[PDB]
Amino acid sequence: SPGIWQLDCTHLEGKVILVAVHVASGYIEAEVIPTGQETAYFLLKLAGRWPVKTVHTDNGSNFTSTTVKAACEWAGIKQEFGIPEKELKKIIGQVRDQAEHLKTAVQMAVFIHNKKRKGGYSAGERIVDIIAT
Amino acid sequence: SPGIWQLDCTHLEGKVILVAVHVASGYIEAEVIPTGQETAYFLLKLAGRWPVKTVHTDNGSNFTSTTVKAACEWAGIKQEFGIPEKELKKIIGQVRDQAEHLKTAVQMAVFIHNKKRKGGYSAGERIVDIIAT
Numbered sequence A, B: 001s002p003g004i005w006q007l008d009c010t011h012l013e014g015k016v017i018l019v020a021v022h023v024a025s026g027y028i029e030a031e032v033i034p035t036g037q038e039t040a041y042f043l044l045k046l047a048g049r050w051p052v053k054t055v056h057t058d059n060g061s062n063f064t065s066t067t068v069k070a071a072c073e074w075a076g077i078k079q080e081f082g083i084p085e086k087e088l089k090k091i092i093g094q095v096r097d098q099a100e101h102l103k104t105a106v107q108m109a110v111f112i113h114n115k116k117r118k119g120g121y122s123a124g125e126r127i128v129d130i131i132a133t
């Protein structure tokens, strides 16, 4: 559906990368964070940009953050357990020597992930096509 | 056109709020920053999320940041001078007592700005409709 996202944690250079995948398109947003506060904020910003209706996670961590819960309540996000990111670290590796900070290489890699084609449609075209329909 | 943005600086509680408006839709992204580094990063993240082709500013500040220029070069953004945000501070004022940090109230206000209708279409529906067409 248009508003189903999967949320996960990956790691590089001792830092946490928050990764939201729009399931039907493969579209991603990611951010390097230092906590629940950061995830709540990331979710609130993602919800003002796109239709975010259900967020899937793989474990119980996000069900225990009183601050994730308030962000979800505010923005009208349902959390669901049991989801309906090596590529991401692949493209970070392709670009890492183009940027001084990890966070910059992440955003360069999101850019490439979302803009490239698999002829055909990019994840960026795909999420907009799904939301238009 | 689908990729024309206007970029501006507003201020509240001694902090700088970076505001990108998609011109044809009224869609906004904003972020509280402490510099050119922050604007470059904000622009790179905005360009991986949407078609960003031309960014208009009102003064000369952004034409002097060697780091804005490299972000623009990387992502394929043209800077243009001479643009082709009280509402934003209105909705921050409506919500400010709902959040501890300014940055949270900003994102709450972006959420409302982008999701509300003027019957009719929200700025969020409008930017997706323009990009689909």
Ligand SMILES: Cc1ccc2oc(C#Cc3cccs3)c([C@@H](C(=O)O)C(C)C)c2c1
Residues within 6 Å of the ligand: A098, A099, A100, A101, A102, A104, A105, B037, B038, B040, B041, B042, B044, B067, B070, B071, B072, B074
């Ligand atoms: C090409 C390009 C595009 C966008 C970019 O955004 C940032 C940034 C930033 C930060 C904000 C707050 C703490 S770090 C950069 C840096 C980098 O390469 O890491 C810059 C020092 C050259 C960057 C380079």
Ligand SMILES: Cc1ccc2oc(C#Cc3cccs3)c([C@@H](C(=O)O)C(C)C)c2c1
Residues within 6 Å of the ligand: A037, A038, A040, A041, A042, A044, A067, A070, A071, A072, A074, B098, B099, B100, B101, B102, B104, B105
């Ligand atoms: C309802 C709701 C939604 C999303 C939210 O995201 C954040 C955050 C954060 C930060 C990350 C890094 C430095 S501060 C909050 C806070 C707030 O109200 O200011 C929280 C202390 C309650 C918040 C509240």
